[PDB]
A and B are shown apart, each in its own frame.
Chain A
């Protein structure tokens, strides 16, 4: 049968031009006020999926 994508991971990772995957930073949901503005500012932009984690994202997204 067709492989089923992990739908939770498909809603959080997008494939990039060179095959990478971008995801949003953690730690920015509901305890952010006590965090310095510089810390929040660095967490706002999108990030690249790490070399250690490359296999898991691709595994969750086999068709994309």
Chain B
């Protein structure tokens, strides 16, 4: 296993985040997706971050 897990953090500042994986050899550009934020109870754009 060489694919590494990443976290997608909401841009709304609630601090909620999702986790997934991404291929580091390809697709260098950051991952942007619209996902539901339970804190604001709305679907917002989630931005890629680093798991730590």
Q: How many A-B residue pairs have CB under 8 A?
A: 3
Can you offer 3 A-B residue contacts whose CB atoms are under 8 A? Answer: A33-B5, A33-B19, A33-B20
Residues of B within 8 A of A (CB-CB), count? 3
Range class of the A interface residue count: under 10
Q: How far is the CA of A12 from the CA of B19 in the complex (A)?
A: 29
- Report which A residues bind B (CB closer than 8 A): 33
Q: How far is the CA of A33 from the CA of B7 in the complex (A)?
A: 10
The minimal Cβ–Cβ distance linking A31 to chain B, given in whole angstroms, is: 11
Give the residues in chain A near B20, CB-CB below 8 Å. 33
Q: Which of B14-30 contact A (CB under 8 A)?
A: 19-20
Give the residues in chain A near B5, CB-CB below 8 Å. 33
